[PDB]
């Protein structure tokens, strides 16, 4: 502690008094991973390896849930020309659970791939596929001219050419009403300046890069405020209580001590949040009990020391701690302050300010030489 104070004050000589230093905190002993124990693999093949993809004006949405996903086998495949995620890291998709997953599949051209990203402007963006500006998820795109482009001309993919107004995000429109591009209204199958809303392209392999067909899939999952039912392939671990642990519930990580709580979470309620928007109660995904989480014991540490030119002996005050946990604060697990020999005992004195170790409590009273607090003061005397 004297060396730590010398390091904090940036001086070799320390004047008599009390000095706060970097506080102690109990490093968690082990880690907890609690996931729902579903085992069935998600039907990713039916999405990525489907026979025919839906048209862009009728993009196909699949609700993927109640299954185990492994995004590593998806990422490591180089067949995908474009693979970018917004709001999440592809390497971290494995380690975090998903509330609900929507996979959108369609076919576009290379030059319009940029239109897939949220907030962009283009025919696809303006008329048949608009992403919200706050999109989170991933997008994957890869050319399919070897599977979807025909020499005789493929006309089975269409898009909406004009609209009365730009579509809302994630809106799908199927109406085939004629667009009245001219001022005069019209009816019938066709009319002058009366464009048919759907327009197709001639898929043919001779087209260069930028006009080749591209199969595109978008994952638009939302995270961490709902009963997540999609998780990575990593196995869970056993549950322990009354110890500071690195817990991880459904991708929500944290460090703290767990206890059997009594807060009635409704069936749609999985997490409870405090005033600081931090988690305080959690529902286990395997057992339906409710547990309170508390940040394990930490508090400020002060060093009481007379003048270094008088002595090198110090005492340390752990503030705000009924420190019968100091015997539990053994260096089998780790603590932020390395030194622990002062925990030897038989010189521990408990005060309303915490506990002071390294000083002997006496009955006879003297003037407050060095203030400790709560009426207790320290001094250096024979």
């Amino acid at each position: 502690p004297l060396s730590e104070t010398k390091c904090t004050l940036k001086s070799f000589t320390v004047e008599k008094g009390i000095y706060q230093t970097s506080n102690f905190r109990v490093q968690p002993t082990e880690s907890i991973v609690r996931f729902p124990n579903i085992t069935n693999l998600c039907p990713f093949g039916e999405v990525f390896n489907a026979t025919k993809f839906a048209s862009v004006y009728a993009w196909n949405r699949k609700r993927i849930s109640n299954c185990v996903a492994d995004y590593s086998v998806l990422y490591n495949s180089a067949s995908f020309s474009t693979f970018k995620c917004y709001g999440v890291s592809p390497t971290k998709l494995n380690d975090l659970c998903f509330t609900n997953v929507y996979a959108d599949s369609f076919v576009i051209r290379g030059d319009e791939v940029r239109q897939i990203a949220p907030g962009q402007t283009g025919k696809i963006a303006d008329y048949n596929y608009k992403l919200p500006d706050d999109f989170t998820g991933c997008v994957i795109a890869w050319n399919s001219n070897n599977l979807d482009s025909k020499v005789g001309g493929n006309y089975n993919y269409l898009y909406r050419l004009f609209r009365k107004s730009n579509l809302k995000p994630f809106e799908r429109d199927i109406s085939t009403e004629i667009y009245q591009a001219g001022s005069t209204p019209c009816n019938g199958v066709e009319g002058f300046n009366c464009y048919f809303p759907l327009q197709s392209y001639g898929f043919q392999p001779t087209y260069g890069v930028g006009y080749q067909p591209y199969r595109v899939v978008v994952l638009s999952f939302e995270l961490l405020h709902a009963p997540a039912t999609v998780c990575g392939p990593k196995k869970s671990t056993n549950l322990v209580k009354n110890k500071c642990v690195n817990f991880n519930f459904n991708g929500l990580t944290g460090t703290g001590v767990l206890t059997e709580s009594n807060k009635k979470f409704l069936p749609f309620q999985q997490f409870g949040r405090d005033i600081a928007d931090t988690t305080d109660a959690v529902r286990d995904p395997q057992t339906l009990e409710i547990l309170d989480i508390t940040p394990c014991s930490f508090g400020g540490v002060s060093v009481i020391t007379p003048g270094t030119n008088t002595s090198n002996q110090v005492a340390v005050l752990y503030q705000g701690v009924n420190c019968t946990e100091v015997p539990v604060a053994i260096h089998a697990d780790q603590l932020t302050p390395t030194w622990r020999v002062y925990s030897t005992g038989s010189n521990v004195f408990q005060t309303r300010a915490g506990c002071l170790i390294g000083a002997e409590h006496v009955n006879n009273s003297y003037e407050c030489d060095i203030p400790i607090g709560a009426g207790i003061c320290a001094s250096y005397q024979t």
Binding site: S89, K92, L252, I275, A276
Partner: protein, 98 residues
């Protein structure tokens, strides 16, 4: 004896002390509430930022978080210093009256 009637019946008499306490509590409570704001980051909880974002892209949101929270503590410390100066003035007046 009239003091006994004055203090026990009305409660606003000790208001000059109560506002000393409440403000501090409020000054603390707002400081806690500042941990709930995004400050431009995609998520308020730093654990969420660490979990969802890789060590390269996480840094830009995390830096926003430190910027906002450090500004919040700077404001709180400045307010505490001003309030402590006011309380020192009141305490010096009390010492003079004593």
């Amino acid at each position: 004896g009239k003091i006994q009637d004055s203090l026990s019946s009305t409660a606003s008499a000790l208001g000059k002390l109560q506002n000393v306490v409440n403000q501090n509590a409020q000054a603390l409570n707002t400081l806690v509430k500042q941990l709930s704001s995004n400050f431009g980051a995609i998520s308020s909880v730093l654990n969420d930022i660490l979990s969802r974002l890789d060590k390269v892209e996480a840094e830009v949101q995390i830096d926003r978080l430190i910027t906002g929270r450090l500004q919040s503590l700077q404001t709180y410390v400045t307010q505490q210093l001003i309030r402590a100066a006011e309380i020192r003035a009141s305490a010096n007046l009390a010492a003079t009256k004593m």
